[PDB]
């Protein structure tokens, strides 16, 4: 039976005490246990009535269920959403995470597990400090709540509490003998997340607690990420700690100025110049212990500026905004080593800003530097490839020539990224497999858009040879989508999802030029899907044979001339003539179809189901196989 339990769960979710009392009336102990303890499914959440009562803050419901029915405080279920699929949760965890102190009080007084651990080693104290309620955290601590207990990545309650801007709970935890040197997964401490969140009070309380400033696993000290997070207030307080020496504080100031130079929400010129000037003065004040920066060589992408060692050099570029942005980016990746995660975002944003005023060459150069940084960092970069496709389509649509080495470099990075996606999804787990496959398909689509753009533009013979070399490399890699589509099937399918931002105005699938280029690059023609459709079975179903006749005719000509079977069958034994919804494609294929006795004999062999095993050559076996 399930109707009564479902009604009880619904009433507990809605908090109807009268309905719950009516449904639980005249029920035995087994009936009470089944009604209160069955884990119901609703709205993508698998939770108990007590769990959904505590999450919704139904103090009356939870006290009625606990005082009389003495329901056990050891229920399990799926709670929360938006990346929170945490299982094994009790009602106390939900009550603490929902900011309802009364429900927590009732549960704990009824015997809730204060030190309950969920699937990801999560305590109700961590949820309570995540919500930001002082009373819940205090009362749970008063019932022997171990703050040192953390998740599987070693993120204690102090760190996650310091992530948000709540002074009371973090001050109480610091009073509660919390660990200020706790190590996260990548060697991070709570001071790192306090600094990057821009919370001056939490940072000053942590350094009051002798936070033991130290770099993370990557090697970024929390003052560096404070400078990166574009928060001057949290940066300008570690000077009094008397442990920053001189190099650490000065590189913090330089990185803070660099981060102020280029960001989406913290973009300004005047304060950037002020802090850069202050940092340079602090470097060049004493003279005896003067600090000399390790000047990186001028990369051609970042103009032709070899830093500013002299004060007059900095003064001469103070009046120019673009020079300030470029110098800020250079010093930013010099401090960050050009190998950090936070390096690609400013250069990508600056590339977009350069794209704002139709400065397409500078945008392409800056984003190519960004893409090379992402590739050397082994970071997934499908969105960057997508925005290269978008910009290339935009600049084609505005009648402005595309640099052939630029698109060649983007195609090289595209085939490398597709290979990376292949060997990532090769050994991916079930948790992230859907997004891994989606990224693989997106990379394939971006490659197709890039090839379409390369066909749209005209280049010299050597550049075309390089582009065809990259295309042939990807073809030899032999990619496949989730539904068995190769590159040819996508290039001939009108259902291939083209991006709607700017590629939709240029990249139009099916496209004759991309298919011709793929076939010239040795694309396999007779590949099949999971449904058995080849490129011909896909093109013959084209819905626009009249208004777009040139593309359809050219696709059919290229597919036939490159070698394709006009009567090969799919899994449902449908020849491309059968699949051809439009008669125009039927008679185009018939004009391309050539009568062969081999095909007729193979059709007879398949229709009569005569055993052809070992009776024919090895090639003829598969030939009959797909006829």
């Amino acid at each position: 039976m399930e109707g009564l339990a479902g009604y009880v769960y619904k009433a507990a979710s809605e908090g109807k005490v009268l309905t719950l009392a009516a449904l639980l009336l005249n029920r035995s102990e087994s009936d009470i246990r089944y009604l209160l303890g069955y884990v119901s499914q609703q709205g993508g959440q698998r939770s108990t009535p007590l769990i959904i009562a505590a999450r919704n803050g139904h103090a009356k419901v939870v006290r009625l269920l606990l005082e009389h029915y003495r329901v056990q405080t050891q229920q399990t279920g799926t709670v929360r959403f938006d990346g929170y699929v945490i299982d094994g949760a009790t009602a106390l965890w939900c009550a603490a995470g929902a900011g309802h102190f009364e429900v927590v009080k009732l549960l704990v007084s009824h015997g809730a597990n204060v030190n309950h651990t969920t699937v990801t080693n999560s305590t109700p104290l961590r949820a309570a400090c995540f919500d930001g309620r002082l009373d819940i955290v205090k009362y749970l601590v008063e019932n022997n709540a171990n703050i040192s207990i953390a998740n599987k990545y070693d993120n204690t309650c102090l760190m996650i509490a310091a992530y948000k801007g709540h002074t009371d709970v973090v001050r109480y935890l610091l009073e509660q003998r919390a660990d200020p040197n706790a190590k996260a997964h990548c060697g991070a401490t709570a001071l790192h997340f306090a600094a990057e969140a821009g919370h001056i009070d939490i940072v000053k309380e942590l350094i009051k607690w002798r936070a033991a400033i130290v770099v993370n696993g990557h090697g970024m000290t929390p003052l560096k990420v404070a400078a990166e997070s574009c928060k001057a207030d949290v940066v300008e307080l570690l000077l009094s700690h008397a442990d920053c020496d001189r190099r650490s504080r000065i590189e913090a100031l330089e990185l803070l100025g660099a981060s102020f130079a280029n960001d989406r929400e913290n973009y300004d010129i005047i304060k950037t110049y002020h802090y850069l000037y202050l940092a340079m003065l602090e470097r060049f004040q004493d003279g005896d212990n003067i600090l000399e920066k390790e000047v990186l060589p001028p990369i051609h992408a970042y103009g032709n500026r070899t830093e500013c060692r002299n004060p007059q050099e900095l003064e001469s570029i103070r009046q120019d905004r673009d020079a300030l942005h470029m110098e800020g980016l250079i010093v930013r990746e010099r401090i960050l080593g050009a190998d950090n995660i936070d390096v690609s975002h400013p250069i990508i944003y600056r590339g977009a800003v350069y794209a704002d005023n139709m400065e397409f060459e500078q945008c392409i150069k800056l984003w190519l530097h960004a893409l090379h940084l992402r590739q050397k960092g082994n970071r997934n970069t499908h969105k960057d490839l997508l925005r290269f496709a978008q910009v290339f389509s935009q600049m084609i649509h505005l009648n402005e020539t595309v640099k052939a080495p630029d698109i060649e470099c983007v195609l090289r990075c595209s085939v490398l990224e597709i290979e990376q996606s292949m060997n990532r999804v090769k050994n991916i787990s079930d948790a992230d497999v859907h997004n891994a496959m989606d990224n693989y398909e997106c990379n394939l689509y971006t490659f197709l858009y890039l090839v379409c753009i390369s066909t749209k533009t005209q280049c010299s013979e050597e550049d075309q040879c390089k582009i065809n070399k990259q295309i042939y490399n990807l073809i030899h890699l032999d990619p496949r989508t989730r539904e068995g589509f190769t590159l040819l099937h996508l290039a001939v399918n009108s259902n291939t999802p083209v991006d709607d931002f700017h590629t939709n105005d240029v990249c139009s699938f099916p496209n004759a030029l991309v298919t011709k280029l793929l076939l010239d690059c040795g694309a396999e023609v007779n590949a099949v899907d999971n449904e058995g459709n080849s490129a011909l079975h896909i093109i013959v179903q084209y819905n626009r044979p009249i208004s777009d006749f040139l593309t359809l005719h050219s696709i059919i000509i290229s597919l036939v001339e490159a070698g394709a079977h006009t009567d090969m069958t799919n899994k449902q034994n449908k020849t491309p003539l059968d699949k051809s919804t439009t008669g125009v494609s039927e008679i185009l294929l018939k004009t391309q179809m050539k009568m062969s006795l081999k095909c007729l004999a193979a059709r007879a062999v398949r229709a009569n189901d005569i055993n052809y095993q070992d009776q024919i050559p090895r090639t003829l076996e598969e030939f009959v196989g797909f006829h």
Binding site: R80, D82, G83, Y84, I86, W93, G97, T120, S122, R126, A127, F130, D131, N151, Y153, N155, I160, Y163, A184, H185, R264, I341, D342, H345, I348, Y349, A352, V353, A355, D356, N380, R387, Q390, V391, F501
Partner: peptide
């Protein structure tokens, strides 16, 4: 609509951080 508005923050890194910042 343009690129500059369509650029997002480190949401994928934030999504990767959602594993470590879970309550």
């Amino acid at each position: 609509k343009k690129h500059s508005l369509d650029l997002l923050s480190k949401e994928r890194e934030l999504n990767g951080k959602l594993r470590h910042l879970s309550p």
